[PDB]
Ligand binder design. Structure first.
Ligand SMILES: O=C(Cc1ccc(Cl)cc1)Nc1ncccn1
Length: 460
């Protein structure tokens, strides 16, 4: 039975509004309703992995697991295995996988982050799950960010705290946050970004939604505008939104948006908004294709509609050779020519590089680079031809060309990372000098970039 080179992943996000679900929720797992929906011809085909994020979830873990498993069994006639479940307050993540994947899944991690301080600590934050699927690392984050149209900057802060402090994936990757630890990272939830239009336009917005004319609403969506201005979710992707705003509905119908200020809303307006979202970030040149992104029409117990997204994702096998793992394969090497880092820092410490990859026995520290003054004020750290030669555990190009090198540039004075990035070994040629490039981030903010040339030697 051969190992897969692709899997499908279902991502769900639903703010349940503290109400139990209706008896049937299969439309969610089938990607049926509005938006980019799944073909009917696929309905009996199980996804490999289902990741369910809920917010304002009133159910016990046991109660929700029974509903989810019984739902999937009705659709697929498959009894899914529970990979992980983690709950912070009323924010929950469940990962389910086909039984054939049980002995492909390992290194399961869960964590949570509580956002805010005092007043604003006690119900918002994030839960997450990571694991290895054969040779591929997968991370999943369900966040419930700060509410309210006027609090976009609080949401951006919540985002930075979650990606700094959520402790998932390989702890040996110590310079790297969750935005660099995984081959594929999915981040979803009630992100709570709103359509930033005047209150007086509520009925006009509703009109536009009834016409299925979303363009003038999406151009004011705070998440799209904050992402375009590089304020949040830098280097994440989102599929085009082609479904109606998923908040705020009158319960037990979808015919009415309930936007007016009420004591129950703290006298705040809730103009129709795309609160409920799915984004992802995959390592460079790894296959990832969104095959659905939409909302259900028939699940009406909450003031939010459920959102679904599905993906084709590239995966690799757990490779063994005569040599690695447990030794190097002298027929493999990775060389770096004409390399330099450009950093936004006002500091003047010496800097060195760390190279981290599961194709290495352990991470590799470089010598210090040579600082020059850049012509526009920036710091340029020159490595030239001085970077060490990396010795992969396996030389077979079927393995090595699928790998990635994580780079941290660190202060010699403090050993703190000033920037993190990632280089793909999926090159156009071997034994050939080729340009490489990554942006550098720290705490998920842009801090610089790393560029130079690579020369990769494989067994072929
Ligand atoms: O339970 C797991 C991890 C796992 C892996 C795959 C899946 Cl589909 C579900 C769970 N390991 C384990 N095994 C025996 C005793 C204790 N822990």
């Amino acid at each position: 039975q051969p190992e897969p080179d692709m899997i499908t992943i279902f991502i769900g996000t639903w703010n349940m509004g503290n109400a139990p679900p209706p008896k049937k929720i299969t439309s969610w797992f089938l990607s049926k309703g509005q938006g980019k929906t799944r073909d009917d011809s696929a309905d009996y085909i199980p996804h490999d992995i289902y990741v369910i994020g809920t917010q304002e979830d009133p159910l016990s873990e046991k109660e929700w697991l029974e509903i989810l498993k019984h739902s999937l069994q009705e659709i697929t006639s498959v009894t899914f295995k529970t990979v992980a479940i983690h709950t912070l307050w009323n924010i929950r993540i469940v990962v389910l996988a086909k039984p054939e994947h049980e002995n492909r899944i390992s290194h399961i991690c869960t964590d949570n982050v509580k956002t805010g301080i005092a007043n604003t600590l006690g119900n918002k934050g994030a839960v997450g799950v990571s694991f290895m699927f054969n040779g591929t690392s997968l991370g999943f984050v369900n966040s419930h960010l700060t509410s309210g149209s006027e609090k976009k900057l609080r949401r951006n802060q919540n985002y930075m705290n979650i990606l700094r402090f959520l402790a998932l994936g390989d702890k040996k990757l110590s310079p790297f946050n969750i935005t660099h630890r995984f081959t594929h990272l999915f981040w979803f939830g009630d992100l709570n970004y709103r359509v930033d239009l005047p209150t007086w336009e509520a009925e006009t917005i509703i009109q536009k939604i009834k016409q299925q004319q979303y363009a003038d609403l999406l151009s004011h969506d705070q998440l799209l505008t904050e992402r375009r201005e590089q304020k949040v979710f830098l280097h994440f992707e989102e599929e085009e939104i082609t479904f109606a705003p998923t908040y705020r509905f009158e319960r037990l119908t979808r015919d009415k948006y309930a936007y007016t200020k009420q004591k129950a809303t703290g006298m705040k307006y809730n103009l129709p908004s795309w609160c409920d979202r799915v984004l992802w970030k995959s390592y460079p040149l790894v296959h990832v294709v969104c095959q659905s992104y939409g909302s259900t029409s028939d699940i009406m117990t909450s003031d939010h509609s459920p959102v679904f997204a599905t993906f084709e994702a590239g995966v690799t096998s757990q490779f063994v050779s005569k040599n690695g793992p447990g030794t190097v394969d002298s027929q493999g090497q990775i060389e770096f020519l004409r390399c330099y880092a450009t950093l936004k820092t006002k500091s003047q410490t010496k800097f060195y590089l760390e190279f981290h990859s599961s194709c290495l026995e352990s991470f590799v520290k470089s010598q210090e680079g040579e600082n020059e003054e850049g012509s526009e004020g920036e710091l340029v750290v020159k490595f030239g031809e001085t970077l060490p030669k990396l010795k992969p555990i396996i030389s077979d190009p079927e393995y090595l060309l699928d790998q990635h090198i994580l780079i941290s540039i660190k202060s010699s004075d403090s050993d703190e990372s000033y920037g993190e990035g990632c280089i793909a070994l999926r090159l156009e040629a071997t034994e050939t000098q080729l340009p490489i490039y990554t942006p550098l981030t720290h705490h998920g903010e842009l801090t610089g970039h790393f560029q130079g040339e690579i020369k990769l030697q494989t067994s072929q």
